[PDB]
């Protein structure tokens, strides 16, 4: 069974994995205002990955006989100054998610909860792919700041990641 | 182009189609606490339909050269008294969504916006299927109030509706 | 929910879509008395389309939580003077059905019933095909009034429309 | 050729095979008001069998060089007290159809009409299947009068008989 | 039947859907003078869509028993100052077509013509795709005004839309 | 390169190959008023052949580094006295097209333009098929002037030529 301090902190992180998806849906509503429908299709596909991260804390709380509480999801930022700053704010956010998985994992070792630190092993290994898949694109945008020719070619090459959920809906 | 009173009211309804999906995810977190994993798989599949409803207001605002603003999604109710009251509160919610589509459609006729009232024709025809797909199950639960044998058989027959997004995630 | 004046008028039109099928079955009993078994197979296939029109008012009343009342279907006319007058009386009947769909659609706009006027949109678009599929054949019979050679060739070309229900029964 | 007393009595029975189908469509409008959409899909499929019975008297009158006259189809009963009494009134009706086939068959032997008594041999052999397919379900409802668990399981097992005409319309 | 004021206004719009196709054939004769054979293959494929729009007013007038009158198609503009101004003049033209569909749809509601306003529902839903498929390309040309590298890459990516009629002719 | 007198005369003939298609679309709007939907489907398929003739002068002017100018297409005749006179006016028109190809071909030999007279060799060989495909049908209508039985059988046999563009649009 989950203790009161670990069930509350797994519920706070399930709220952060849904505010993540409600932030990558406020960036896709920003890039598709600029006409960058390959950046916007990159961000929507990341807002469906992050829903799949919150259905893993959800299925873990009901495997360990807990109870999921849903709080309010706050207002995400609307606009950024440039498509560079919209990825420096998505990479600063992925270092805020990982900072809070490491304080879940340092919480499960204090309470001697071996079946939770075994579960956070998936999210520690997967945030290494999340920080690097954004730092790749963030370094292609510092490679082209006053060059619309390259930004036109980043829109197309990132359009290979298309969301699969509108194909079902 | 969308007027200021119609772009604001299409943005308020995109917030209601995402609070819908954040309400059917607070019912799936209720039925899966009772051990009713067929009611909980019904509700998660409805929380992925309602995300697909908010990606239609989203793609309409960027077809009509607007701008999507995302507000905060409030706290949904946690627990209900019974699995009957958890569907009387999902049917009262589907009569609140439809009350606000009819005040979008009575707004687009006041502003003489023929390309928006043509778009809400999909959501008027589809809320007739949403109010009836809940009133079917709500009438099977008033048919069995002190009968766990039938509630055990509603859990299995509603488990045919499984969410397709965990199969991709 | 359907109001008392709209549930009564949807029930009157479900009685007209079954008297339609009981009129095209009194024309098929007329053309097959003259030996015109291609005109008679045209009319029986229209009496199975019109049953399919009354199973759409029927499924709409039980989607909107109503109650279908069945009145008596009156006696259709037995004989007409010619196979021309048996289509001038089927085209005058298809202008009587459409006159009553337009008084359902002008009733749903008076009561501000957006989910019924959305439903009658199918029957407004489909009576345009019904008035034209009879006016085609009615204009081929004014093209041949004292010519049995052409009436022998309208019997065969209209025999391509065969009823599918005797193939199952 | 058909005599005047046998053409009139074959036309009266073609009116009873269409009031049959307009009675099983007033029971399907009753069971689908109670939410029993497997009883209602049983009754609609019987209202398409009984139309196929009246297209056999119809094709026999035009094989024997007669003339089909269509009278008015009266008002069927609207509601019954229970789903038991809605099958005791469909079994009392199938003993009224068979009572009138036996008075057609005792009419064709009085007029020495061997080609009509040969034709009613199909309807005598088929009403034995009609009285027994209703007495099966009528005896499953006297087996469960104060048991909604079994009535919930008769709704599903009778839903295997689905009408084929809405699949074409 | 179509009234004299609605048959005249449906005939004026069939003349505008053929002057549309005779304008997108004067832009394809402009882009293929500049050597932009991907812009020119985009415009020819739009001049075959707009012929398909005038064969829908044509088939509607002969479903409603009218008469199509063909007036003269005026001289389209020959040259524009740039490939930007050749899309600002095709987007100003698609806001002139839609302004005249909305004055057909506001004409069919004044004459209480429900079967014409039901037909213009296709053209209201489809001009939303026409104004947006031009505003996409018009915003890619304001993204590159003094950049021939990007205009060379818009010629190729718009060459995926090839006209199907020279493949048959 | 094309001279000024040959570029102007190739542009005048591209205007005649589009007024041809706007004449066979005023005959299809005449035959489909008489209910002759096989004559009307013959004429629409000829109005798509003649568009394919004007896309050959168009692709030749941009192979020879010219410039296509589009003038106005005048009003075609609305009605003729009979379906005989609607083919005597389409055969008199096909002798007016061929009279002007022969004055293009006698113009390219005066200017010693061997690459244009080589191109008009296709249109000289193809107008022999156009004058004969109309003179076949024109001689079947002088074979039946007071015979609606044969005119009913010319409508069906000419309906094998169906336009392929509405199948794509």
Residue numbers in the entry:
A (entry chain A), B (entry chain A), C (entry chain A), D (entry chain A), E (entry chain A), F (entry chain A): 1 to 169
Give verbatim lines from the article.
The sample solution is contained in electron-transparent nanochannels that provide uniform thickness gradients without further optimisation and eliminate the potentially destructive air-water interface.
To probe the resolution limit of data collected using the cryoChip, we merged data from three chips filled with ApoFtn acquired on a Titan Krios equipped with a post-GIF K2 camera and processed it in a standard single-particle analysis workflow. The reference model for 3D alignment was generated from the data itself using the stochastic gradient descent method, suggesting that the quality of data collected from cryoChips is sufficient to allow initial model generation even for samples considered difficult for reference model generation. To examine the compatibility of cryoChips with the condition to form vitreous ice, we evaluated the fraction of images containing crystalline ice by manual inspection for the presence of ice rings or crystalline reflections in the computed power spectra from all images. For comparison, we also acquired datasets for ApoFtn and T20S on conventional holey carbon supports with the same acquisition parameters, yielding reconstructions at an overall resolution of 2.4 and 3.2 Å. Analysis of the orientation distribution showed increased abundance of views along the fourfold rotation axis for ApoFtn, indicating preferential alignment of particles with the SiNx membrane.
